[PDB]
Design an enzyme around this catalytic site. Structure first.
Site, PDB file in Angstrom:
ATOM      1  N   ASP A   1      25.632  51.489  64.464  1.00 37.93           N
ATOM      2  CA  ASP A   1      24.802  50.412  64.973  1.00 37.93           C
ATOM      3  C   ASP A   1      24.816  50.346  66.494  1.00 37.93           C
ATOM      4  O   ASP A   1      25.768  50.774  67.107  1.00 37.93           O
ATOM      5  CB  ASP A   1      25.278  49.133  64.293  1.00 37.93           C
ATOM      6  CG  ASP A   1      24.502  47.905  64.645  1.00 37.93           C
ATOM      7  OD1 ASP A   1      23.253  48.015  64.845  1.00 37.93           O
ATOM      8  OD2 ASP A   1      25.095  46.770  64.656  1.00 37.93           O
TER       9      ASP A   1
ATOM     10  N   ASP B   1      23.487  47.054  68.625  1.00 36.41           N
ATOM     11  CA  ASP B   1      23.885  45.732  69.100  1.00 36.41           C
ATOM     12  C   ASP B   1      25.129  45.266  68.355  1.00 36.41           C
ATOM     13  O   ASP B   1      25.195  45.258  67.116  1.00 36.41           O
ATOM     14  CB  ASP B   1      22.759  44.720  68.925  1.00 36.41           C
ATOM     15  CG  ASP B   1      21.554  45.150  69.614  1.00 36.41           C
ATOM     16  OD1 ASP B   1      21.521  45.100  70.865  1.00 36.41           O
ATOM     17  OD2 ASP B   1      20.588  45.629  68.970  1.00 36.41           O
TER      18      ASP B   1
ATOM     19  N   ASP C   1      28.184  45.593  62.672  1.00 37.04           N
ATOM     20  CA  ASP C   1      28.760  44.248  62.712  1.00 37.04           C
ATOM     21  C   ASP C   1      28.197  43.206  61.799  1.00 37.04           C
ATOM     22  O   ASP C   1      28.748  42.096  61.705  1.00 37.04           O
ATOM     23  CB  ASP C   1      28.786  43.707  64.147  1.00 37.04           C
ATOM     24  CG  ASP C   1      27.426  43.464  64.678  1.00 37.04           C
ATOM     25  OD1 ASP C   1      26.610  44.385  64.616  1.00 37.04           O
ATOM     26  OD2 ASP C   1      27.117  42.370  65.208  1.00 37.04           O
TER      27      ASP C   1
HETATM   28  O1  LIG Z   1      21.297  37.209  66.752  1.00 35.43           O
HETATM   29  C1  LIG Z   1      20.922  38.384  66.810  1.00 35.43           C
HETATM   30  C2  LIG Z   1      19.562  38.698  66.990  1.00 35.43           C
HETATM   31  C3  LIG Z   1      19.142  40.009  67.052  1.00 35.43           C
HETATM   32  N1  LIG Z   1      20.058  41.009  66.932  1.00 35.43           N
HETATM   33  C4  LIG Z   1      19.604  42.413  66.929  1.00 35.43           C
HETATM   34  C5  LIG Z   1      18.962  42.907  68.220  1.00 35.43           C
HETATM   35  C6  LIG Z   1      17.867  43.837  67.836  1.00 35.43           C
HETATM   36  C7  LIG Z   1      17.471  43.509  66.430  1.00 35.43           C
HETATM   37  C8  LIG Z   1      18.592  42.749  65.798  1.00 35.43           C
HETATM   38  O2  LIG Z   1      19.043  43.750  64.871  1.00 35.43           O
HETATM   39  C9  LIG Z   1      19.947  43.288  63.882  1.00 35.43           C
HETATM   40  P1  LIG Z   1      20.375  44.669  62.766  1.00 35.43           P
HETATM   41  O3  LIG Z   1      19.129  44.975  61.897  1.00 35.43           O
HETATM   42  O4  LIG Z   1      21.520  44.131  61.983  1.00 35.43           O
HETATM   43  O5  LIG Z   1      20.706  45.889  63.651  1.00 35.43           O
HETATM   44  C10 LIG Z   1      21.415  40.677  66.765  1.00 35.43           C
HETATM   45  O6  LIG Z   1      22.219  41.635  66.711  1.00 35.43           O
HETATM   46  N2  LIG Z   1      21.846  39.382  66.702  1.00 35.43           N
HETATM   47 MG   LIG Z   2      24.625  44.859  65.145  1.00 31.41          MG
END
Ligand SMILES: O=c1ccn([C@@H]2CCC[C@H]2OCP(=O)(O)O)c(=O)[nH]1
Ligand SMILES: [Mg+2]
EC number: 3.1.3.-
Length: 195
Positions: free
Chosen positions: A9, A11, A144
């Site tokens: 991942d 973020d 995460d």
């Molecule tokens: O509160 C939030 C809002 C958005 N995000 C991510 C930033 C880009 C898109 C969103 O992806 C979550 P993922 O699908 O779990 O990777 C977060 O990680 N936390």
């Molecule tokens: Mg993430």
């Protein structure tokens, strides 16, 4: 023999979304209450801010919809060095598996740019941008987010939960496991999935 495939991942795992968000929120909205990282609970930042005061969900969203939000995120400690080492290992293929936000003007571009900045142009071919991670096949997914769902009810990967402020108190169902940080022994986790 067959390569081990690892999805990582962005973020909350490579890029410090939570810290970047809080710093820019406080800078832009000094008037408004905020949530310290030790008090974060629940995956979605905006949902917690939305309980804290009416209007604050929309203010929160406006921080990550802004130009340069994604590009200017700092790497988490040890993340760049670990993923570089991991990608160099024998019989190991590493992909970055990340989602765009709904407003798509800057986020996909800036995520590519961020990977180029920290991993180099040759690593761009390892990016998978998708809202559904269950349709991407691999041995491992390091992410995460506690509950990862989608169109595939039985994904091929084992999800290893990467610790973040919002998930650090969660008790998981056995046999689910964690990677506590990039300082933790990620090589052992990979090794446990090899032939
Ligand atoms: O509160 C939030 C809002 C958005 N995000 C991510 C930033 C880009 C898109 C969103 O992806 C979550 P993922 O699908 O779990 O990777 C977060 O990680 N936390
Ligand atoms: Mg993430």
């Amino acid at each position: 023999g067959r390569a081990l495939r690892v999805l990582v991942d962005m973020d909350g795992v490579l890029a410090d979304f939570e810290g970047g968000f809080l710093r820019k929120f406080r800078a832009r909205f000094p008037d408004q209450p905020f949530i310290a990282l030790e008090d974060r609970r629940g995956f979605w930042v905006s949902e917690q801010y939305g309980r804290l005061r009416p209007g604050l969900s929309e203010k929160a969203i406006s921080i990550w919809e802004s130009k340069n939000f994604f590009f200017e995120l700092e790497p988490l400690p040890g993340a760049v060095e670990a993923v570089k080492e991991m990608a160099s290992l024998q019989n190991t293929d590493v992909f970055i598996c990340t989602s765009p936000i709904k407003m798509f003007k800057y986020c996909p571009y800036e995520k590519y740019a961020w990977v180029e900045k920290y991993f180099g142009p040759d690593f761009l071919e390892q990016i998978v941008l998708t809202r559904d991670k269950t349709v991407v096949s691999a041995d491992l997914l390091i992410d995460d987010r506690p509950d990862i769902t989608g169109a595939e009810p039985t994904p091929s990967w084992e999800h290893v939960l990467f610790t973040a402020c919002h998930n650090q108190h969660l008790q998981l169902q056995p046999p689910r496991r964690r990677l506590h940080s990039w300082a933790d022994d990620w090589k052992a986790i990979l090794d446990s999935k090899r032939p």
